[PDB]
Enzyme design. Structure first.
Site, short mmCIF file in Angstrom:
data_model
loop_
_atom_site.label_atom_id
_atom_site.label_comp_id
_atom_site.label_asym_id
_atom_site.label_seq_id
_atom_site.Cartn_x
_atom_site.Cartn_y
_atom_site.Cartn_z
N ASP A 6 -0.60 7.14 6.54
CA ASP A 6 0.06 8.20 5.79
C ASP A 6 1.26 8.73 6.61
OD1 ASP A 6 -0.94 10.98 7.01
OD2 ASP A 6 -2.72 9.64 6.77
N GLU A 97 -5.41 21.96 4.54
CA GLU A 97 -5.11 22.04 5.98
C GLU A 97 -5.44 23.45 6.46
OE1 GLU A 97 -3.36 18.36 6.52
OE2 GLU A 97 -3.18 19.87 8.12
#
Length: 207
Positions: A6, A97
């Protein structure tokens, strides 16, 4: 297992073809963050990945204190989170996150579950399918109360930088993708899909 990785604008240049030739079969590419930020390298990465024969999708860096989940799903979808059954497109990934100032962005566990629900369901009506959810184990446990609400609908992308995936949060049976380090050779983070390339192609097609 199938290798992938990613990336984001933190990798301004990527040798997509070199990644494929080394064994990568998919890449997940930052599209958006919050209400206002589009990653400037998204289109460069998505085009390069396509031509190199990588399966690819976008991701959205959630900012739950900044707007509703619906508003961020609309923004993501309009700016790189689209999905079709062309065979080379992953469902878009919701990236949860730790916050800038606090782990759970100032939301209660029930507010966080509601915010993710609104993102997830908005993405489903816009694209036709549920998004993937990216999380670490302890983030999901503390910030959602270890919610199982998404375990039957949204593929899990589990981050754990270890030799083993560890415990699966949220009543998911298994992770669909494991993010196992932040040191992929071509840039960005290393990922591994749970199963074979044929199973990954089926995930992209939405069969």
């Amino acid at each position: 297992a199938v290798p992938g990785f990613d990336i984001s604008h933190y990798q301004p240049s990527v040798n997509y073809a070199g990644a494929y030739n080394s064994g990568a079969r998919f890449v997940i590419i930052k599209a958006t963050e919050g209400t206002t930020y589009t990653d400037p390298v998204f289109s460069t990465h998505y085009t390069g990945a396509t031509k190199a024969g990588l399966i690819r999708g976008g991701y959205h860096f959630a900012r739950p204190a900044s707007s509703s989940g619906s508003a961020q799903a609309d923004f993501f979808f309009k700016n790189g989170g689209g999905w079709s059954a062309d065979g080379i497109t992953l469902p878009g990934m919701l990236d949860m996150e730790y916050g800038s100032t606090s782990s759970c962005h100032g939301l209660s566990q029930t507010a966080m579950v509601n915010w993710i629900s609104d993102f997830v369901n908005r993405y489903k009506t816009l694209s036709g399918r549920y998004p993937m959810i990216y999380t670490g184990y302890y983030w999901w446990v503390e910030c959602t109360g270890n919610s199982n609400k998404f375990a039957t609908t949204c593929p899990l992308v589990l981050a754990r930088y270890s030799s083993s995936v560890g415990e699966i949060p949220g009543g998911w049976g298994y992770q669909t993708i494991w993010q196992f380090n932040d040191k992929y050779a071509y840039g960005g983070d290393s990922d591994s899909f749970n199963g074979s390339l044929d199973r990954l192609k089926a995930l992209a097609k939405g069969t």
